[PDB]
Design a protein around this nucleic acid. Structure first.
Lengths: 312, 273
DNA sequence: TCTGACCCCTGAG
DNA sequence: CTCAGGGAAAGTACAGA
C-alpha cells in the first residue's frame, strides 16, 4: 500500500529552542547525519510515488500519550505552528531545511495549546488523535473559518487544561503526515503518520551536550585517590559522574569512576574529584586510557578525554 | 540630640531579592557579625533617651539622596519602609530583620510614584529630580528618628545615612570569594599553575593579588583562563627572595580593579628553589 | 529563622 | 560587516536546616 517514511531523523541533541524574545536567525534543527559542514537536514519520503503530494509537520509531546505540543515550527514554509510542503515534482522525497523550534513561555502554554488544538479541528491537515481520540471524526475535510460545535468546543478547552498540566517544554517531537490527491482535487487522502526521534533543547541542563573543558591534571598514579580539578559545561550536581575507561583486546570492559559528593560540584561548572584506582596497580609501564563525562540519567557522554596512568 | 550609627550594615554578600522569591526575604547582617556571633544594624541616640519613634527607608547611594525604588521589607515594613516606636528604656537600638526587596525593571516608574504618593523623601528632593536613572544594585539605609522637645512636642531629628549596601546578585558589586584552590604552596620562582574556584566574577574585571610585607605581585592569566565566571586558572608570581631557605607565608586574594575590592585573604606558602 | 538552581555579546566567515 | 550561536544577566522558584 501507499505509506510515508522518514529518510533522516532529526538530530536529537545540540539545538536550543528559541523563545520569541530570543529573536530571529539563531540556527535551525540540523539533520541527524550532519557529521561535518555537510549542513544536513530532515527528509521524508512517500513510497507509492503518487505524483502530486502534500506533506505536513507539527510538533508533538514525547510522553507515552502522543499529543500536540505548545512549541511551534518557525522556519521554512511554516505558518501558525506547522510546516507544509509539496511533493508533486519529479520525486517523492521531501526535505526540511532551516526551520527552528520556537520555545513558548510557560504561562502561554495553555493559551497556545488550546489555540493549536482548536486550529487542529477547524483545519483538516491536523488529525484528531492529537487533540482527543473522541474527535478523530474530523480528519481532513474542507477549509474556511467557522465555529465548531459549542458542545465539542468545551471538551477542547478541557483537553488543553488536562494536557497543559504535564507538558514538558524541554523536549518535542516531529509528527510527519502525508495527504494524497482526493476526488475533488483536495489533498485529503491521509496516510499513516510517523513520529520522529525526540528532540532535546540544548539549554535544559539535563539534555545539553556534555564537555570537559580542561583538567588541572591528565595523569595520575594507578593507586588512585588523587584529587583532580575538572572544568566543564553546565551539568547537574545530581545527575553526573566521571567515568574512566579502557578498550582492551577482549573488548574494553574496564571502567572506573571519579569519587565525589555533589557538594564537590562548583556552581555546575566544575568538579573536584578523586581518581579511581586503576585495574592493575602492578603495571610497569604507563597505561593510557580515557576519561569522559557521563549523564547518569540518559547515560549520554562527552568526547572522551585521554588520561595517563603511571606506575606506583 | 542626634542619631549615631554604632554598627553599619555589611556592605556586600547579601543579594537583593525579588517578590517572586520567598515571602520572607533576607535580613541585613551587621558588619562585624561573624559566622558564629551575628550582629545587626545599630544606632544610638546621643543627647536623648526616652519616648519617640524611628523610621528607616532606602535612598540612593549618591548625593542627591532621593527615594529609592526598592522596598525595605521585613517586620514592621509597609509601603517600602520600616517604622516602629523606640524603647524608652534604652538609647541604643538595633534592627534584626531588614531586607531589600529589589523591584523589577519595568516597575521602575510605578515604584517612584509610590515613593512620591507616599511622602517618602527624607531629603525633600525636588520632584523633577526623581526621574533620573537609578542605580539598582546599591542603596543606603536612612534613619529618620523622631524624639520630643522640652515642650514635649514631636521633634524630627536630622536624617542619617549608613554605608552603601550592594546587591550581591550583581558580580560587579558582589562580595569577592575564593571557594577552593588547587594548591597553596609553590617555589619562590613562581610559574606554578593554580586552579581557583570562586563565586561569580567578571573575567574583564578580576585579579589574584599576592601580598606580603614589602612585596606585592599578581597572578598571571588571561580572560580566556576564566572559566564561566566561577573558576580561574593562573600562574603564580615570583616571590621577592629568589633563594628562600625556609617557607614564607604570604596572602592570596581576589581583587576587583573597578572598585578595588578585595576578598578575604587565603594563605599561600612560598617554598625553596 | 533564613538562606542556598531554575538580554546582548563575540567568533566565525 | 551578517548571523549563527553562546555567554551574561534579569527575574522565578522551591527546599532544606
Amino acid at each position: 500500500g501507499p505509506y510515508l517514511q522518514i529518510l533522516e531523523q532529526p538530530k536529537q541533541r545540540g539545538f536550543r529552542f528559541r523563545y520569541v524574545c530570543e529573536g530571529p536567525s539563531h540556527g535551525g534543527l540540523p539533520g541527524a547525519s550532519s557529521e561535518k559542514n555537510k549542513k544536513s537536514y530532515p527528509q521524508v519520503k512517500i513510497c507509492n510515488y503518487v505524483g502530486p503530494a502534500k506533506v505536513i509537520v507539527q510538533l508533538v509531546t514525547n510522553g507515552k500519550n502522543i499529543h500536540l505540543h505548545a512549541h511551534s515550527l518557525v522556519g521554512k514554509h511554516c505558518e501558525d505552528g506547522v510546516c507544509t510542503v509539496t511533493a508533486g515534482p519529479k520525486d517523492m522525497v521531501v526535505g526540511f531545511a532551516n526551520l527552528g523550534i520556537l520555545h513558548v513561555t510557560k504561562k502561554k502554554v495553555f493559551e497556545t495549546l488550546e489555540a493549536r488544538m482548536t486550529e487542529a479541528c477547524i483545519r483538516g491537515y491536523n488529525p484528531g488523535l492529537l487533540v482527543h481520540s473522541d474527535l478523530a471524526y474530523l480528519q481532513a475535510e474542507g477549509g474556511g473559518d467557522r465555529q465548531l460545535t459549542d458542545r465539542e468546543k468545551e471538551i477542547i478547552r478541557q483537553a488543553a487544561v488536562q494536557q497543559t498540566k504535564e507538558m514538558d517544554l524541554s523536549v518535542v517531537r516531529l509528527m510527519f503526515t502525508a495527504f494524497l490527491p482526493d476526488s475533488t482535487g483536495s489533498f485529503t487522502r491521509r496516510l499513516e503518520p510517523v513520529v520522529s526521534d525526540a528532540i532535546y533543547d540544548s539549554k535544559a541542563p539535563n539534555a545539553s551536550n556534555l564537555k570537559i573543558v580542561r583538567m588541572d591534571r591528565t595523569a595520575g598514579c594507578v593507586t588512585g585517590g588523587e584529587e583532580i580539578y575538572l572544568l566543564c559545561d553546565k551539568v547537574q550536581k545530581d545527575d553526573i559522574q566521571i567515568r574512566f575507561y579502557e578498550e582492551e583486546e577482549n573488548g574494553g570492559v574496564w571502567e572506573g569512576f571519579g569519587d565525589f559528593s555533589p557538594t564537590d560540584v562548583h556552581r555546575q561548572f566544575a568538579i573536584v574529584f578523586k581518581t579511581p584506582k586503576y585495574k592493575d596497580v602492578n603495571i610497569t609501564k604507563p597505561a593510557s586510557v580515557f576519561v569522559q563525562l557521563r549523564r547518569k540519567s540518559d547515560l549520554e557522554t562527552s568526547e572522551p578525554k585521554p588520561f595517563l596512568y603511571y606506575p606506583e | 540630640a542626634y542619631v549615631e550609627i554604632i554598627e553599619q550594615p555589611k556592605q556586600r554578600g547579601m543579594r537583593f531579592r525579588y517578590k517572586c522569591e520567598g515571602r520572607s526575604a533576607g535580613s541585613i547582617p551587621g558588619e562585624r557579625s561573624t559566622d558564629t556571633t551575628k550582629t545587626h544594624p545599630t544606632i544610638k541616640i546621643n543627647g536623648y533617651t526616652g519616648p519617640g519613634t524611628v523610621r528607616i527607608s532606602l535612598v540612593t547611594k549618591d548625593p542627591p539622596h532621593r527615594p529609592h525604588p526598592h522596598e525595605l521589607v521585613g517586620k514592621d515594613c509597609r509601603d517600602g519602609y520600616y517604622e516602629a516606636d523606640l524603647c524608652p528604656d534604652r538609647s541604643i537600638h538595633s534592627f534584626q530583620n531588614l531586607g531589600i526587596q529589589c523591584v523589577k525593571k519595568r516597575d521602575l516608574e510605578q515604584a517612584i510614584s509610590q515613593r512620591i504618593q507616599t511622602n517618602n523623601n527624607p531629603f525633600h528632593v525636588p520632584i523633577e529630580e526623581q526621574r533620573g536613572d537609578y542605580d539598582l544594585n546599591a542603596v543606603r539605609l536612612c534613619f529618620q528618628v523622631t524624639v520630643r522637645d522640652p515642650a514635649g512636642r514631636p521633634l524630627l531629628l536630622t536624617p542619617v545615612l549608613s554605608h552603601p549596601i550592594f546587591d550581591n546578585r550583581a558580580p560587579n558589586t558582589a562580595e569577592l570569594k575564593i571557594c577552593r584552590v588547587n594548591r597553596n604552596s609553590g617555589s619562590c620562582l613562581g610559574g606554578d599553575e593554580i586552579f581557583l574556584l570562586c563565586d561569580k566574577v567578571q573575567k574583564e574585571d578580576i585579579e589574584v593579588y599576592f601580598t606580603g610585607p614589602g612585596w606585592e605581585a599578581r597572578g598571571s592569566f588571561s580572560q580566556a583562563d576564566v572559566h564561566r565566571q566561577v573558576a580561574i586558572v593562573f600562574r603564580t608570581p615570583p616571590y621577592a627572595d629568589p633563594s628562600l631557605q625556609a617557607p614564607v607565608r604570604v596572602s592570596m586574594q581576589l581583587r576587583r580593579p573597578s572598585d578595588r575590592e578585595l576578598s578575604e585573604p587565603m594563605e599561600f606558602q612560598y617554598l625553596p628553589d
